Amino acid sequence: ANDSIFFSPLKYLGAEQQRSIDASRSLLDNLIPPSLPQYDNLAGKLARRAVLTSKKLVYVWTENFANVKGVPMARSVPLGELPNVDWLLKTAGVIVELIVNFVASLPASAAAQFERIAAGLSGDLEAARQVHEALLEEAKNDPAAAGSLLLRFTELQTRVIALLTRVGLLVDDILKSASNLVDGLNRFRAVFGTLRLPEVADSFRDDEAFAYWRVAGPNPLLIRRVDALPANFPLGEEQFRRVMGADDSLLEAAASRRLYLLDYAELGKLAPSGAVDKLLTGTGFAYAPIALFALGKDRAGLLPVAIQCGQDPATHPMFVRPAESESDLYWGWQMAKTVVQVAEENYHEMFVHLAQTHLVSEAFCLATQRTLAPSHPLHVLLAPHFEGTLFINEGAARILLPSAGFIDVMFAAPIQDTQATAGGNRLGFDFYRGMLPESLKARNVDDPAALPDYPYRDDGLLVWNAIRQWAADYVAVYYASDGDVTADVELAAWVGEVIGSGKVAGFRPITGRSQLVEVLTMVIFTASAQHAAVNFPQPSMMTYAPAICAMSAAPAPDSPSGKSEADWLKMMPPTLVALEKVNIYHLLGSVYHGRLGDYRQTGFPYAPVFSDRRVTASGGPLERFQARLKEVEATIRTRNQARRKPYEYLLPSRIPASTNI
Numbered sequence: 095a096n097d098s099i100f101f102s103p104l105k106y107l108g109a110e111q112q113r114s115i116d117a118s119r120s121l122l123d124n125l126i127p128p129s130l131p132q133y134d135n136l137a138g139k140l141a142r143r144a145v146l147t148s149k150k151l152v153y154v155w156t157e158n159f160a161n162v163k164g165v166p167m168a169r170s171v172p173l174g175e176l177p178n179v180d181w182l183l184k185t186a187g188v189i190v191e192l193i194v195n196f197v198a199s200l201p202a203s204a205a206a207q208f209e210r211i212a213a214g215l216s217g218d219l220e221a222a223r224q225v226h227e228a229l230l231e232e233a234k235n236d237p238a239a240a241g242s243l244l245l246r247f248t249e250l251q252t253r254v255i256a257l258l259t260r261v262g263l264l265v266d267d268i269l270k271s272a273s274n275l276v277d278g279l280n281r282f283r284a285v286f287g288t289l290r291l292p293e294v295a296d297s298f299r300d301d302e303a304f305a306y307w308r309v310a311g312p313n314p315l316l317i318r319r320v321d322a323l324p325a326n327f328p329l330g331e332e333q334f335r336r337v338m339g340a341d342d343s344l345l346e347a348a349a350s351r352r353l354y355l356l357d358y359a360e361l362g363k364l365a366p367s368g369a370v371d372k373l374l375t376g377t378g379f380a381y382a383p384i385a386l387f388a389l390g391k392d393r394a395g396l397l398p399v400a401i402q403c404g405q406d407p408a409t410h411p412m413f414v415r416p417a418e419s420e421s422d423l424y425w426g427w428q429m430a431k432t433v434v435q436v437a438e439e440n441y442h443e444m445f446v447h448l449a450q451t452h453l454v455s456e457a458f459c460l461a462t463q464r465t466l467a468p469s470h471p472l473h474v475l476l477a478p479h480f481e482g483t484l485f486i487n488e489g490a491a492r493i494l495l496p497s498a499g500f501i502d503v504m505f506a507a508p509i510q511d512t513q514a515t516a517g518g519n520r521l522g523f524d525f526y527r528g529m530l531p532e533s534l535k536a537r538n539v540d541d542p543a544a545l546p547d548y549p550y551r552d553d554g555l556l557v558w559n560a561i562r563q564w565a566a567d568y569v570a571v572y573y574a575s576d577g578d579v580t581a582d583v584e585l586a587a588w589v590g591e592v593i594g595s596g597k598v599a600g601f602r603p604i605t606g607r608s609q610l611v612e613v614l615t616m617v618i619f620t621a622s623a624q625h626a627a628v629n630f631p632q633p634s635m636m637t638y639a640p641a642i643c644a645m646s647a648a649p650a651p652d653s654p655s656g657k658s659e660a661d662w663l664k665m666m667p668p669t670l671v672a673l674e675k676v677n678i679y680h681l682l683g684s685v686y687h688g689r690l691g692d693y694r695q696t697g698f699p700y701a702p703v704f705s706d707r708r709v710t711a712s713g714g715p716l717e718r719f720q721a722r723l724k725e726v727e728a729t730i731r732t733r734n735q736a737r738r739k740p741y742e743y744l745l746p747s748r749i750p751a752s753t754n755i
C-alpha cells in the first residue's frame with residue numbers, strides 16, 4: 095500500500111544517479127587539505143568520525159564469502175568501488191577479442207550458436223569506445239565545462255557494465271556446452287587460433303630455460319640456497335659429480351653457496367596423494383616435488399641437477415639430469431621436469447599470486463576505508479593502490495572459484511581442497527617475513543656475487559627502495575616525530591582492524607615513523623610491483639599447457655629409465671584445460687590499468703591524487719619519486735640488454751598502482 099509523501103525521494107533515485115552523485119561528491123571531498131586527526135579542529139574531528147561510521151556500513155568484513163570461507167573479504171563491493179569506464183573498456187576489449195578468437199576456431203556448425211552474439215558485442219564495444227573518445231575530445235575543447243561532463247561519463251559506465259553483463263551471459267553459454275565443443279602437442283597450439291604462441295613454446299624442453307623459471311618466472315619466491323641437503327632428498331656424491339663434472343662435490347658447492355632447492359612441501363592438499371577423477375577433466379594428478387639446482391664454478395647459469403617427484407624418497411625415485419647421449423633417461427627427465435611445472439602453477443597461482451597479492455591487498459583496502467578518514471593523508475596515499483581490488487577479488491571468488499569453474503578445471507585438487515589451501519596460505523602469510531628484503535635474506539638469495547642472474551631480486555630491490563624513499567618523504571610531511579605516530583587514533587584503529595578482522599599474520603602495533611615507512615612500503619609494493627611481477631608473466635609464460643599446467647593426466651614418472659615420448663604425452667592435460675588456460679591467462683596479463691607513481695585519477699577528470707602543495711611541489715616528494723622511477727626504468731633496460739632473456743615485469747612503466755586484474 096501507498097502513496098506516502100515519505101516515499102517521494104525513492105520514486106526517482108536509481109543506482110546510475112547515485113553513482114553520478116557520489117562521483118561529483120568525490121571531487122568535493124578531495125578539496126579538503128589532508129590532516130592527522132589530532133591536528134584537525136573540532137569540526138574536522140566530528141565530520142571524520144561521522145564519515146568513518148557511515149563507511150563501516152558500506153565496507154563490511156566477512157569470513158563466510160562464497161567459495162573463499164575463512165578469508166577476510168568484503169561482504170559486497172560498494173557502488174563507488176565498481177571499476178571506472180577506462181578499466182571496463184580495456185577489460186571488455188580483451189574478453190571480446192578472446193571470445194571472437196575462440197568462436198572463429200569452432201567448426202562453422204558449432205560456431206553458428208555464438209558468432210552473431212559475439213559480433214554484436216564487438217560492434218557495441220567499438221561504439222562505447224567512440225563515445226569515450228568523443229567525451230575526451232569535448233573535455234579538451236572546453237576544459238571549463240569538464241565538471242558538467244561527469245554525468246555522461248557515468249552513463250557510459252552503465253553502458254559498459256550492461257555490455258560486460260551480456261559478455262558474462264555468452265561466456266556461461268559457451269561453458270555450458272564446453273565439453274561438447276571438445277607431434278601430439280598440436281591440440282595445444284590449436285587452442286590459440288590467431289594468437290601467437292608464447293616464447294616458452296619453443297624453449298620449454300631446454301634444461302637451462304627450466305632452471306631460469308626459478309629466478310625470472312612467475313614464482314621467483316620459492317627458490318632458496320641449500321647448505322646441507324634435507325634428509326628426505328638423498329642425492330649422493332657420485333650422482334652429483336655425474337651431472338656436475340668429475341671435479342665438483344656436494345660439500346664444496348654447498349660451502350661455495352652454489353646449491354639451490356625448490357621444495358613444494360607447503361602445497362599440502364594442492365598436491366593430492368593420488369588420482370583425482372573429475373567429471374569435466376577425467377583423472378588428474380598434482381605433486382609436491384623436491385628439486386636441486388646448482389651453479390657451475392663460473393656461476394654462468396643455474397642448472398637443474400636432480401628431481402624427486404614427491405616428499406617421501408622411499409616411494410619417489412631420484413631423477414638425475416641426463417647427458418645428450420643418455421637416450422634411455424631422456425623421457426623420464428622431461429616427465430620429472432613436467433612434475434615440477436605442475437607443482438609450480440599450483441604454488442604460483444594459489445599462493446604467490448592469489449593468496450599473497452590479491453587476498454592480502456583485500457584486507458588493507460577494507461582497513462583503510464573503515465578506519466582512515468578520506469582526509470587522512472595515509473588514506474590519500476593508499477586509496478590509489480586499492481583501486482578495483484575489492485571488485486577483482488569478488489570476481490575471483492564468484493567467477494573463478496566455484497565448482498566446474500576455471501580453477502576446478504585447471505587445478506588437479508578437489509575444488510574444496512583448492513579453496514581451503516589457498517585460504518590457509520593467505521592466513522599464514524607473515525606481513526614482515528613476506529617483505530622483499532626479508533624474503534631474500536631468509537632464503538639466502540640476496541647476494542648478487544653468490545647468485546648473479548636473479549632478475550626479480552635486482553629489479554625488485556630497485557622498485558622497493560624507490561617506494562620506501564617516497565613513503566619516507568610522504569610520512570615526513572605529516573609526522574614530525576614518533577609522537578605523532580602514537581597520537582594518531584585513526585592509524586591505531588587501522589592497525590587494530592588489520593590484526594583483528596583483517597587477519598594479517600605478523601602485523602603488530604605501529605609505534606614510530608621508521609616502522610610506518612616499512613609498513614607503507616610493503617603495502618604499496620604488494621599492491622603494485624609484487625602483483626605486476628607475478629601476474630604479468632601469465633600471457634608469455636603460462637598460456638601454453640605443455641610448458642606448465644596445474645594438472646597432469648598421468649602419475650609422476652615411476653622410473654628414470656625406459657620412459658618414452660608417449661609416456662610423457664600421457665601427462666598432457668585434456669583440451670578443455672588448455673582452452674580455459676589460454677583464455678584466462680591472456681586476459682589476466684593483458685589489462686594494465688593505472689601506473690605506479692602517476693598519482694592521477696585513472697578515470698575522468700584524471701585530476702591529481704594530491705592537493706597538498708608540499709607533496710606536489712616542484713622538486714618535491716612526488717616529483718622525486720616519479721624521477722626515481724624513470725631512473726629505475728633506464729637501469730632495467732640496460733640490464734635487459736645484458737640478460738639471456740629480457741625480464742620486463744618490474745619496468746615501472748608496466749607496473750599498475752593497484753591489484754585490479
Ligand SMILES: CCCCCC/C=C\CCCCCCCCCC(=O)OC[C@H](COP(=O)(O)OCCN)OC(=O)CCC/C=C/CCCCCCCC
Pocket residue numbers: 185189192193196258259261262263265266268443444447448452486487489490493494500501504673674677678681682755
Ligand atoms: C586461474 C588462476 C588465477 C588465480 C588468480 C585470481 C586473481 C583474480 C582474477 C579474477 C578474475 C575474475 C574473472 C573475470 C575478469 C573480467 C572482469 C569481470 O568482472 O567480468 C564481468 C563479466 C560479468 O560478470 P557476471 O557476474 O555478469 O557473469 C560472470 C559469469 N557468470 O564476467 C565475464 O565476462 C566472465 C569472465 C570470465 C573469463 C572468460 C575468459 C575469456 C572467454 C573467452 C572464450 C571462452 C573459452 C573457454
Ligand SMILES: [Fe+2]
Pocket residue numbers: 447452625629682753755
Ligand atoms: Fe592478478
